[PDB]
Amino acid sequence: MNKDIATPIRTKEILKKYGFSFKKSLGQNFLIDTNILNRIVDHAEVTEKTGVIEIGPGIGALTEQLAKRAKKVVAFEIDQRLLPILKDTLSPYENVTVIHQDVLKADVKSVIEEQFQDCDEIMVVANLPYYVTTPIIMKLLEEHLPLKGIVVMLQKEVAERMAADPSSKEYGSLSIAVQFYTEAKTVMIVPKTVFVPQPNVDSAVIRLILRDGPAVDVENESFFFQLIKASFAQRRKTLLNNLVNNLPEGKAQKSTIEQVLEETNIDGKRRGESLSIEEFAALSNGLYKALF
Ligand SMILES: C[S@@+](CC[C@H](N)C(=O)[O-])C[C@H]1O[C@@H](n2cnc3c(N)ncnc32)[C@H](O)[C@@H]1O
């Protein structure tokens, strides 16, 4: 409780024992609020059922809280300087494995196979480094990993885009990408005062529950995502305009794109940002057949 890593004094004591200096280049902002940490663990429903992938353990503030509930925790940490610290701070916990490696170069599926054979369910729970929040989430989702869900702390503005409702000004290609694979919900907003050092931007905790199969039925995922990106490329322009200018087929096959919009009952004159994920799926299947 009060003796845990994540108290302001305890955190400082550790950092001082090792003379640790933060690297803003690695998004190092450590949690020093045990109620926040416990809250995150609650939102991830971590029990003895659960094997947990943690990204960016730091000096172990969240790791410790996860370790008390989970069957097993594996934590990827990029900073070699933290490794001896974690060995010390997490010495009371025998269910923790730290792997020294940038999560973006890891083969997470192999790690899951090797480490979590005895777990009923796998969660990702993490206070993410803000400089690569979106790459990390995209990697985890793109690779169809056998996860129940992902609960992470990240920039507020990023959570808001991930979880965006279609009426939200934050609705975008990122909303669609996340919501294709998951049900997304921003569950907490956290002040800057619960970290050391305090971050420059606001923070939030988002909860992503992996869907049993994709949200919509599309012929071709690759094509679907490129279409999404082309459609949102300029906020104020028509969907047609965006497609002509952003699909490489756009300026070669414009008439075919106009025919498909007509055939799928989607007014080109609407903005791309008006389209729901279902309309995007319909448009994508129609275009994929025509385009190819
Ligand atoms: C925001 S801090 C959070 C630390 C700790 N989880 C906490 O809440 O106190 C981010 C952590 O991610 C680590 N990190 C940064 N980039 C990384 C990457 N690509 N892969 C794995 N860890 C990374 C940092 O070294 C740092 O420990």
3-state SS of 209-270 is EECCCCCCCCCCHHHHHHHHHHHCCCCCCEHHHHHHHHCCCCCCCHHHHHHHHHHCCCCCCC
Q: CA-CA distances (angstroms) from residue 91 to 63, 87, 216?
A: 12, 6, 46
Closest atom of ligand 1 relative to the 126 alpha carbon: 6
Q: How far apart are CA 247 and CA 231, in angstroms?
A: 9
Cis amide linkage into residue 129, ω under 30° from 0? no
Q: How far apart are CA 113 and CA 133, in angstroms?
A: 24
Q: How far is the CA of 58 from the centre of ligand 1 (A)?
A: 6
Q: How far is the CA of 231 from the centre of ligand 1 (A)?
A: 33
Q: DSSP state, 192?
A: G
Structure tokens at 179: 């919501």
Closest atom of ligand 1 relative to the 79 alpha carbon: 25
Q: DSSP state, 119?
A: -
- Burial of residue 117 (number of CB atoms within 10 Å: 0-12, 13-18, 19+): exposed
Residues 6 or more apart whose CB falls under 8 angstroms from that of 140 comprise 108, 124, 147, 150
Q: What Å resolution does this PDB entry report?
A: 1.9
Asked whether the beta carbons of 68 and 10 are under 8 A apart, the reply is: no
Helix, strand, coil percentages, rounded to 5, for the chain: 45, 20, 35
Short-list 158, 159, 161, CA closest to 169: 161
Structure tokens at 23: 């690297």
Residue 121 annotated as lining a ligand binding site: no
Short-list 233, 240, 266, CA closest to 254: 240
Atom 13 of ligand 1, nearest CA residue = 56
Q: How far is the CA of 154 from the centre of ligand 1 (A)?
A: 11
Asked whether the beta carbons of 33 and 194 are under 8 A apart, the reply is: yes
Q: How was this structure determined?
A: X-ray
What's the distance, Cα to Cα, between the start and end of the chain in Å? 61
CA 281, chain centre distance (Å): 23
Short-list 56, 70, 87, CA closest to 152: 56
Please state whether beta strands 50-55 and 121-127 pair in parallel, antiparallel, or not at all (unpaired). Answer: parallel
Residue 56 annotated as lining a ligand binding site: yes
Q: DSSP state, 100?
A: E
Residue 268 annotated as lining a ligand binding site: no
- For tokens 């989702």, name the residue: 141
Q: CA-CA distances (angstroms) from residue 267 to 82, 238, 274, 279?
A: 55, 9, 11, 11
Q: How many CA atoms lie within 13 A of 212 on its CB side?
A: 0
Structure tokens at 273: 């940002």
Q: What domains appear along the chain, each with residue ranges and CATH number?
A: 1-214 (no CATH), 215-292 (1.10.8.100)
- Ligand 1 binding residues, C-beta < 6 A: 26-31, 55-58, 61-62, 76-79, 102-104, 127, 129, 132
